[PDB]
Amino acid sequence: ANTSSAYNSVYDFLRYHDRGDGLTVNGKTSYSIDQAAAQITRENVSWNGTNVFGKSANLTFKFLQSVSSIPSGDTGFVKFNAEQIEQAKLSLQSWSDVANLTFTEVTGNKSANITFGNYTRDASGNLDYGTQAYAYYPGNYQGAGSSWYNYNQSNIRNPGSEEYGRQTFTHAIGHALGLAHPGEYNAGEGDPSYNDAVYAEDSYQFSIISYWGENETGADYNGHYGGAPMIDDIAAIQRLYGANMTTRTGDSVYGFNSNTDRDFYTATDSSKALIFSVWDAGGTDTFDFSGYSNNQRINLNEGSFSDVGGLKGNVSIAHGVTIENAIGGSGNDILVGNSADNILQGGAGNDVLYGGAGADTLYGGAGRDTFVYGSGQDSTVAAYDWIADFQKGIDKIDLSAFRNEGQLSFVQDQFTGKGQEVMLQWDAANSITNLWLHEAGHSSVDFLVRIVGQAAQSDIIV
Ligand SMILES: [Ca+2]
Ligand SMILES: [Ca+2]
Ligand SMILES: [Ca+2]
Ligand SMILES: [Ca+2]
Ligand SMILES: [Ca+2]
Ligand SMILES: [Ca+2]
Ligand SMILES: [Ca+2]
Ligand SMILES: [Cl-]
Ligand SMILES: [Cl-]
Ligand SMILES: [Zn+2]
């Protein structure tokens, strides 16, 4: 049916970066999260051995202070500096947050599963200012789990201020845990490019084990590097070691006002870029994106991507995660809930809110806001939505999606029985307006949105 542009914007955003299911994207086969995860783990190796899946591990790590040799043949060893140590520990933590891994530092002569060191020259003893980093897969051989970084790169020496350095630590540790590049390519071997990718979603938007920029898949991080595991990385590492169900099991806030004590989930002011895929194992959680003025699009569905703070495709939610609440900023935003009971706050600006299934509580904020309903299942009597700050003559409630079963008619105080009728009923004692919809094919009146405030018939879009 002809539906409104507000509904169409929800319908489209729900399908942003659709994947898998026999789609073709960028002329390549599109993989699901799980297909991408299987591809990233295709070497079938982990610290637990070969072809061992879903098994936790307790691992050691060490910052080498000297070496007998570097397993690649590079030379000019330099130990990690203090900033590299701090950032590497943050990278390790970002992996142990999502998978069932513990990391324990060892020093002195103790062997370690994962090691860190820098190099500066090739096997011929000439300075190497061109390469970046590499690491070795788990195994029982000499050098297994070791990771190596070019100290002549400023991003490697300064990973706390040069985002690519922190990303590189996360990437290399991923190899040291058993993850592979999503395609058969490597640095030094020819000149690969995204054109050589096996599947469309081989980019930083989905995996920081990729070589390819997030622009290759239509995302845009405005020159930033995220630094922590992205959505397919989380699925991949959980395939090997199991998911960590102890992480952030309380009510967690991501974005502004964050309580995660993780830099990559925290924006401290509006100039801060956020790039993350969230893992969260319990509790009632909030995406607080309130500090931005850009028009944002925020989706709470697991697996989905959001456009946050002026970037594109920079936030996603890992498979297995339920995030319950979202707060937009002063821009004109779209906030899309999931089947849970969501509290959505549009903030200032003219926002479109869609609770989806479940009993949602919606605040448009200042501005001309639109609360969208796509199905009778979005607001059943048994689990109805509240719209708590509705402004008569300014906000709108959009029922245009119901046109697909016949144009809805407005009735004043009684239903005829014909169905596809909408009624507003004012409760003067409580100052509540109940919006009732008797839907085609329903014998009883089964859709209700309760509104804290008055509403006019002309505020209801049918
Ligand atoms: Ca939580
Ligand atoms: Ca939750
Ligand atoms: Ca807003
Ligand atoms: Ca919902
Ligand atoms: Ca608003
Ligand atoms: Ca409003
Ligand atoms: Ca709902
Ligand atoms: Cl030169
Ligand atoms: Cl839903
Ligand atoms: Zn790599």
Coordinates of C-alpha atoms and ligand atoms in Angstrom, one line a residue:
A1 CA 0.0 0.0 0.0
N2 CA 1.1 3.6 -0.2
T3 CA 2.7 4.2 3.2
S4 CA 4.1 7.4 4.6
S5 CA 7.6 8.5 4.2
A6 CA 8.1 8.1 8.0
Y7 CA 7.1 4.5 7.8
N8 CA 9.2 3.9 4.6
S9 CA 12.2 5.3 6.4
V10 CA 11.8 2.8 9.2
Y11 CA 11.1 -0.1 6.7
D12 CA 14.3 0.8 4.8
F13 CA 16.6 1.3 7.8
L14 CA 15.5 -2.0 9.2
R15 CA 17.0 -3.5 6.0
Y16 CA 20.2 -1.5 6.1
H17 CA 23.2 -3.8 5.3
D18 CA 21.0 -6.8 4.8
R19 CA 23.3 -9.8 4.3
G20 CA 23.4 -13.5 3.5
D21 CA 20.3 -15.2 2.1
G22 CA 21.5 -15.4 -1.5
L23 CA 22.1 -11.7 -1.8
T24 CA 24.8 -10.2 -3.9
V25 CA 26.5 -7.1 -2.6
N26 CA 29.2 -5.1 -4.5
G27 CA 29.1 -7.9 -7.1
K28 CA 30.3 -10.4 -4.4
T29 CA 28.5 -13.3 -2.6
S30 CA 27.0 -11.9 0.7
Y31 CA 27.7 -13.9 3.8
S32 CA 25.7 -14.1 7.0
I33 CA 27.4 -13.3 10.3
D34 CA 27.9 -17.1 10.8
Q35 CA 29.2 -17.7 7.4
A36 CA 31.7 -14.8 7.9
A37 CA 32.6 -16.3 11.3
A38 CA 33.3 -19.7 9.7
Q39 CA 35.4 -18.1 7.0
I40 CA 37.4 -16.1 9.6
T41 CA 38.0 -19.3 11.6
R42 CA 38.7 -21.5 8.5
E43 CA 42.2 -22.5 9.7
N44 CA 40.4 -24.3 12.5
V45 CA 43.0 -23.6 15.0
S46 CA 42.9 -22.3 18.5
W47 CA 44.8 -22.6 21.7
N48 CA 42.8 -25.7 22.5
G49 CA 44.1 -27.5 19.3
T50 CA 42.8 -28.2 15.9
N51 CA 39.1 -28.5 15.2
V52 CA 38.3 -27.7 18.8
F53 CA 35.2 -25.4 19.1
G54 CA 33.3 -23.7 21.8
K55 CA 36.0 -24.4 24.4
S56 CA 37.2 -21.7 26.8
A57 CA 40.9 -21.0 27.4
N58 CA 43.1 -19.5 30.1
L59 CA 46.1 -17.8 28.4
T60 CA 49.3 -16.1 29.3
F61 CA 50.9 -13.1 27.6
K62 CA 54.3 -11.5 27.8
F63 CA 56.0 -8.2 26.7
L64 CA 59.4 -9.6 25.6
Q65 CA 62.4 -7.7 27.0
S66 CA 64.9 -9.4 24.7
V67 CA 64.9 -12.1 22.0
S68 CA 67.2 -14.7 20.6
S69 CA 65.6 -14.2 17.3
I70 CA 62.3 -13.1 15.7
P71 CA 60.6 -16.0 13.9
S72 CA 60.0 -14.0 10.6
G73 CA 63.7 -13.3 10.3
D74 CA 63.2 -9.5 10.9
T75 CA 65.8 -7.9 13.2
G76 CA 66.3 -4.8 15.3
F77 CA 64.1 -5.9 18.2
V78 CA 62.8 -3.1 20.5
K79 CA 60.7 -3.9 23.6
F80 CA 57.2 -2.4 24.1
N81 CA 57.1 1.1 25.5
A82 CA 54.6 2.0 28.4
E83 CA 51.9 3.3 26.0
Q84 CA 52.1 0.2 23.9
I85 CA 51.8 -1.9 27.0
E86 CA 48.7 -0.1 28.2
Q87 CA 47.0 -0.2 24.7
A88 CA 47.8 -3.9 24.2
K89 CA 46.2 -4.7 27.5
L90 CA 43.1 -2.8 26.4
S91 CA 43.1 -4.8 23.2
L92 CA 43.4 -8.1 25.1
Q93 CA 40.5 -7.0 27.3
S94 CA 38.4 -6.2 24.3
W95 CA 38.7 -9.9 23.3
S96 CA 38.3 -11.4 26.7
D97 CA 35.2 -9.3 27.2
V98 CA 33.4 -11.2 24.4
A99 CA 34.8 -14.7 24.5
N100 CA 35.6 -17.1 27.3
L101 CA 39.3 -16.2 27.6
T102 CA 41.4 -15.1 30.5
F103 CA 44.7 -13.4 30.0
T104 CA 47.4 -13.4 32.7
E105 CA 50.7 -11.6 32.3
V106 CA 54.0 -13.4 32.8
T107 CA 57.5 -12.0 33.0
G108 CA 61.1 -13.2 33.3
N109 CA 61.8 -16.5 31.7
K110 CA 58.3 -17.9 31.7
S111 CA 56.9 -19.0 28.4
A112 CA 53.7 -17.3 27.2
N113 CA 50.9 -18.1 24.8
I114 CA 50.8 -14.6 23.3
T115 CA 53.9 -12.3 23.1
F116 CA 54.5 -8.7 22.0
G117 CA 57.6 -7.1 20.6
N118 CA 58.7 -4.6 18.0
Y119 CA 61.2 -4.9 15.1
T120 CA 62.9 -2.2 13.1
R121 CA 65.0 -3.9 10.4
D122 CA 64.7 -6.8 7.9
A123 CA 66.8 -10.0 7.8
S124 CA 69.5 -8.2 5.8
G125 CA 69.8 -5.6 8.6
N126 CA 68.4 -2.7 6.6
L127 CA 65.9 -0.3 8.1
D128 CA 62.3 -1.2 7.4
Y129 CA 60.0 1.8 7.5
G130 CA 57.3 0.3 5.2
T131 CA 55.8 -2.7 7.0
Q132 CA 53.3 -2.6 9.9
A133 CA 52.8 -5.8 11.9
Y134 CA 52.1 -9.6 11.8
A135 CA 51.4 -12.4 14.2
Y136 CA 51.5 -16.2 14.4
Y137 CA 48.6 -18.6 14.9
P138 CA 48.2 -20.7 18.0
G139 CA 50.2 -24.0 17.9
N140 CA 53.0 -25.9 19.5
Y141 CA 55.7 -24.5 17.2
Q142 CA 58.4 -22.0 18.0
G143 CA 56.9 -18.5 17.8
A144 CA 53.3 -19.6 18.0
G145 CA 51.1 -16.8 19.4
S146 CA 53.9 -14.2 18.9
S147 CA 53.0 -10.8 17.5
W148 CA 55.4 -8.2 16.1
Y149 CA 55.1 -4.5 15.2
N150 CA 57.2 -2.1 13.2
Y151 CA 58.7 0.4 15.7
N152 CA 59.6 2.8 12.9
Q153 CA 55.8 3.5 12.4
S154 CA 54.6 6.3 14.6
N155 CA 51.2 4.6 14.9
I156 CA 52.9 1.5 16.5
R157 CA 54.9 3.7 18.9
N158 CA 51.9 5.9 19.8
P159 CA 48.9 3.5 19.7
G160 CA 47.0 5.6 22.3
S161 CA 46.9 8.7 20.1
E162 CA 47.1 7.1 16.6
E163 CA 44.0 5.0 16.3
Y164 CA 45.5 2.6 13.7
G165 CA 48.1 1.4 16.2
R166 CA 45.5 0.2 18.7
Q167 CA 43.5 -1.4 15.9
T168 CA 46.6 -3.2 14.8
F169 CA 47.1 -4.6 18.3
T170 CA 43.6 -5.9 18.2
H171 CA 44.0 -7.4 14.8
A172 CA 47.3 -9.1 15.5
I173 CA 46.1 -10.5 18.8
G174 CA 43.1 -11.9 16.8
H175 CA 45.6 -13.9 14.7
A176 CA 47.4 -15.0 17.9
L177 CA 44.0 -16.4 19.0
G178 CA 43.4 -18.3 15.8
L179 CA 41.5 -15.8 13.5
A180 CA 42.5 -15.4 9.9
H181 CA 42.2 -12.6 7.3
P182 CA 38.7 -13.1 5.8
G183 CA 40.4 -13.8 2.5
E184 CA 43.5 -15.5 1.2
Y185 CA 45.7 -12.4 1.1
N186 CA 48.6 -11.1 3.2
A187 CA 51.0 -8.2 3.3
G188 CA 54.1 -8.8 1.1
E189 CA 52.2 -11.2 -1.2
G190 CA 51.4 -9.3 -4.4
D191 CA 49.0 -6.4 -4.1
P192 CA 45.6 -7.6 -2.9
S193 CA 42.6 -5.3 -2.7
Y194 CA 39.0 -5.6 -1.7
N195 CA 38.4 -6.8 -5.3
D196 CA 40.1 -10.0 -4.1
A197 CA 37.7 -10.4 -1.2
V198 CA 35.8 -13.8 -1.0
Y199 CA 32.6 -12.2 0.3
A200 CA 31.1 -8.7 0.4
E201 CA 31.4 -8.1 4.1
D202 CA 35.1 -8.4 4.2
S203 CA 35.8 -4.8 5.5
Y204 CA 36.5 -3.0 8.8
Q205 CA 32.7 -2.4 9.2
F206 CA 32.4 -6.2 10.0
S207 CA 35.8 -7.4 10.9
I208 CA 39.0 -5.7 12.1
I209 CA 40.8 -8.8 10.8
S210 CA 40.0 -7.5 7.3
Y211 CA 42.6 -5.5 5.3
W212 CA 39.8 -3.4 3.7
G213 CA 38.5 0.0 4.7
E214 CA 34.9 0.3 5.9
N215 CA 34.2 2.5 2.9
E216 CA 34.3 -0.7 0.7
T217 CA 31.0 -1.7 2.2
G218 CA 29.4 1.8 2.3
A219 CA 30.3 2.7 5.9
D220 CA 32.2 5.8 6.7
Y221 CA 34.3 6.5 9.9
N222 CA 35.7 9.8 8.7
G223 CA 39.3 8.7 9.0
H224 CA 38.9 7.0 12.4
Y225 CA 39.8 3.3 13.3
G226 CA 37.6 1.5 15.7
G227 CA 40.2 -0.5 17.7
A228 CA 37.9 -3.3 19.0
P229 CA 36.3 -6.5 17.6
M230 CA 33.5 -5.9 15.1
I231 CA 30.4 -8.0 14.7
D232 CA 31.8 -10.9 12.7
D233 CA 34.9 -10.9 14.9
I234 CA 32.7 -11.4 17.9
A235 CA 30.9 -14.3 16.3
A236 CA 34.3 -15.8 15.1
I237 CA 36.0 -15.7 18.4
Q238 CA 33.0 -17.0 20.2
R239 CA 32.9 -19.9 17.7
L240 CA 36.4 -20.9 18.9
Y241 CA 36.2 -20.2 22.6
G242 CA 32.6 -19.7 23.6
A243 CA 30.8 -16.5 24.5
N244 CA 31.6 -14.7 27.8
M245 CA 28.3 -14.4 29.7
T246 CA 29.8 -12.6 32.6
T247 CA 30.4 -9.3 30.8
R248 CA 28.4 -6.2 31.6
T249 CA 25.5 -8.1 33.1
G250 CA 24.2 -5.0 34.9
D251 CA 22.4 -2.1 33.3
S252 CA 25.0 -0.8 30.9
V253 CA 25.2 2.5 29.1
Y254 CA 27.1 2.9 25.8
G255 CA 28.0 6.2 24.2
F256 CA 27.7 9.4 26.3
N257 CA 27.5 9.0 30.1
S258 CA 28.9 5.5 29.7
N259 CA 29.5 3.2 32.6
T260 CA 31.5 0.6 30.6
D261 CA 35.0 1.8 31.5
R262 CA 35.9 1.0 27.9
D263 CA 37.3 3.7 25.7
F264 CA 35.7 2.3 22.5
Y265 CA 32.2 2.4 24.1
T266 CA 32.6 5.9 25.5
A267 CA 32.0 9.3 24.1
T268 CA 33.1 12.1 26.4
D269 CA 32.0 15.0 24.3
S270 CA 30.3 15.6 20.9
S271 CA 33.6 15.6 19.0
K272 CA 34.3 12.0 19.9
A273 CA 33.8 9.4 17.3
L274 CA 32.2 6.0 18.3
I275 CA 33.0 2.8 16.4
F276 CA 32.0 -0.4 18.1
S277 CA 30.0 -3.6 18.0
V278 CA 28.5 -4.2 21.4
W279 CA 28.6 -7.4 23.4
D280 CA 26.6 -7.3 26.6
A281 CA 25.5 -10.4 28.6
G282 CA 22.6 -9.2 30.7
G283 CA 20.6 -6.3 32.2
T284 CA 18.7 -3.3 30.9
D285 CA 21.0 -1.4 28.6
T286 CA 20.9 2.0 26.8
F287 CA 22.5 3.5 23.7
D288 CA 23.0 7.1 24.9
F289 CA 23.8 9.1 21.7
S290 CA 22.4 12.3 23.2
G291 CA 25.5 14.5 22.8
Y292 CA 25.4 14.7 19.0
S293 CA 23.7 17.2 16.7
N294 CA 23.9 15.1 13.5
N295 CA 20.8 13.3 12.2
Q296 CA 21.3 9.7 13.5
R297 CA 19.7 6.4 12.7
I298 CA 19.7 4.0 15.7
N299 CA 18.6 0.3 15.5
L300 CA 18.3 -1.8 18.7
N301 CA 17.9 -5.1 16.7
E302 CA 20.6 -7.7 17.3
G303 CA 22.9 -8.0 14.2
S304 CA 21.9 -4.5 13.0
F305 CA 23.9 -1.4 12.1
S306 CA 23.3 2.2 13.2
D307 CA 24.6 5.6 11.9
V308 CA 25.8 7.4 15.0
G309 CA 27.4 10.9 15.5
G310 CA 27.6 11.8 11.8
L311 CA 29.5 8.5 10.9
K312 CA 27.8 5.8 8.8
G313 CA 27.6 2.1 9.8
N314 CA 29.8 2.7 12.9
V315 CA 27.8 1.0 15.6
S316 CA 26.3 -2.5 15.6
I317 CA 24.9 -5.0 18.0
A318 CA 26.5 -8.5 18.2
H319 CA 24.4 -11.6 17.6
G320 CA 23.1 -12.8 21.0
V321 CA 22.7 -9.4 22.6
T322 CA 19.5 -7.5 23.6
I323 CA 19.9 -3.7 24.1
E324 CA 16.7 -2.2 25.4
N325 CA 16.8 1.6 25.3
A326 CA 18.1 4.4 23.0
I327 CA 18.5 8.2 23.3
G328 CA 18.9 10.3 20.1
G329 CA 20.6 13.7 20.0
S330 CA 19.4 17.1 18.8
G331 CA 19.4 16.0 15.2
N332 CA 16.4 14.6 13.3
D333 CA 16.8 11.0 14.1
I334 CA 15.2 7.6 13.5
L335 CA 15.1 5.3 16.5
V336 CA 14.0 1.7 15.9
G337 CA 13.3 -0.7 18.8
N338 CA 13.4 -4.5 18.9
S339 CA 10.9 -7.1 20.2
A340 CA 11.9 -6.2 23.8
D341 CA 10.2 -3.5 25.9
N342 CA 12.2 -0.4 24.8
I343 CA 12.3 3.1 26.1
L344 CA 13.1 5.4 23.2
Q345 CA 13.9 9.1 23.6
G346 CA 14.2 11.2 20.4
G347 CA 15.7 14.3 22.0
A348 CA 15.3 17.6 20.3
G349 CA 14.9 17.6 16.5
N350 CA 12.1 16.0 14.5
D351 CA 12.5 12.3 15.2
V352 CA 10.8 9.2 14.0
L353 CA 10.4 6.5 16.7
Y354 CA 9.3 2.9 16.1
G355 CA 8.9 0.6 19.1
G356 CA 8.2 -2.6 17.3
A357 CA 6.9 -5.5 19.3
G358 CA 6.7 -5.3 23.1
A359 CA 5.4 -2.7 25.4
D360 CA 7.6 0.4 24.6
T361 CA 7.6 3.8 26.3
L362 CA 8.3 6.6 23.8
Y363 CA 9.4 10.2 24.3
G364 CA 9.6 12.3 21.2
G365 CA 11.4 15.1 23.0
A366 CA 11.1 18.7 21.7
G367 CA 10.4 18.9 18.0
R368 CA 7.8 17.6 15.6
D369 CA 8.1 13.8 16.3
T370 CA 6.3 10.8 14.7
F371 CA 5.6 7.6 16.5
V372 CA 5.3 4.8 13.9
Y373 CA 3.3 1.6 14.1
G374 CA 3.8 -1.1 11.5
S375 CA 1.7 -4.0 12.7
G376 CA -1.2 -4.7 15.2
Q377 CA 1.5 -6.8 17.1
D378 CA 3.4 -3.6 17.9
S379 CA 1.0 -2.5 20.6
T380 CA -1.4 -5.2 21.7
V381 CA -3.8 -4.6 24.6
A382 CA -1.8 -7.3 26.6
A383 CA 1.5 -5.3 26.2
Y384 CA 0.6 -1.8 25.0
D385 CA 2.9 1.1 24.3
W386 CA 2.9 4.4 26.2
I387 CA 3.7 7.7 24.4
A388 CA 4.6 9.8 27.4
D389 CA 5.2 13.3 26.1
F390 CA 2.9 13.6 23.1
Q391 CA 2.2 17.2 21.9
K392 CA -1.2 17.7 20.3
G393 CA -1.0 19.6 17.0
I394 CA 2.8 19.0 16.8
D395 CA 3.6 15.3 17.0
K396 CA 2.0 12.6 14.9
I397 CA 1.1 8.9 15.4
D398 CA 1.6 7.1 12.1
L399 CA -0.8 4.2 11.3
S400 CA -0.2 4.4 7.5
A401 CA 1.2 0.8 7.5
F402 CA -2.3 -0.4 8.2
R403 CA -3.4 0.7 4.8
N404 CA -2.2 -2.7 3.5
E405 CA -5.5 -4.2 5.0
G406 CA -7.7 -1.3 4.0
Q407 CA -7.8 2.5 4.6
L408 CA -8.3 3.1 8.4
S409 CA -11.4 5.2 9.2
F410 CA -11.6 7.4 12.2
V411 CA -14.7 7.0 14.5
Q412 CA -15.7 9.3 17.3
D413 CA -17.1 7.2 20.2
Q414 CA -18.1 3.9 18.9
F415 CA -17.0 1.0 16.7
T416 CA -19.3 -0.2 14.0
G417 CA -17.8 -3.7 13.8
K418 CA -16.6 -3.3 10.3
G419 CA -13.0 -3.1 11.3
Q420 CA -10.1 -0.8 10.2
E421 CA -11.4 1.8 12.6
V422 CA -9.4 4.1 14.9
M423 CA -10.8 5.9 17.9
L424 CA -9.3 8.3 20.5
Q425 CA -10.8 8.3 23.9
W426 CA -10.1 10.8 26.6
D427 CA -9.9 9.9 30.2
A428 CA -10.4 13.2 32.0
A429 CA -9.7 11.8 35.5
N430 CA -6.3 10.7 34.5
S431 CA -5.5 13.0 31.6
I432 CA -4.8 10.0 29.4
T433 CA -5.8 9.5 25.8
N434 CA -6.3 5.9 24.7
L435 CA -5.9 5.2 21.0
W436 CA -7.8 2.1 20.0
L437 CA -7.6 0.4 16.7
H438 CA -10.0 -2.4 15.6
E439 CA -8.1 -4.2 13.0
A440 CA -9.5 -6.0 10.0
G441 CA -9.9 -9.7 10.8
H442 CA -9.9 -9.2 14.6
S443 CA -13.1 -10.0 16.4
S444 CA -12.1 -8.0 19.5
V445 CA -10.4 -4.7 19.8
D446 CA -6.8 -5.7 20.2
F447 CA -4.6 -2.7 19.5
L448 CA -4.1 0.1 22.1
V449 CA -1.6 2.9 22.5
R450 CA -2.0 4.9 25.7
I451 CA -0.9 8.6 25.5
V452 CA 0.0 10.8 28.4
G453 CA -1.7 14.0 27.2
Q454 CA -4.3 15.1 24.7
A455 CA -4.3 14.2 21.0
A456 CA -6.4 15.4 18.0
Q457 CA -7.8 13.3 15.3
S458 CA -5.6 15.3 12.9
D459 CA -2.5 14.2 14.7
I460 CA -3.2 10.6 13.7
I461 CA -1.9 9.7 10.3
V462 CA -4.2 7.0 8.6
Ligands
CA1 CA 24.3 -5.0 30.4
CA2 CA 20.0 -6.2 27.8
CA3 CA 16.6 14.0 18.0
CA4 CA 10.0 -2.9 21.3
CA5 CA 12.2 15.2 19.1
CA6 CA 7.9 16.3 20.1
CA7 CA 5.6 -1.8 20.8
CL8 CL 64.1 4.9 0.6
CL9 CL 10.2 -6.0 16.8
ZN10 ZN 46.6 -9.7 9.7

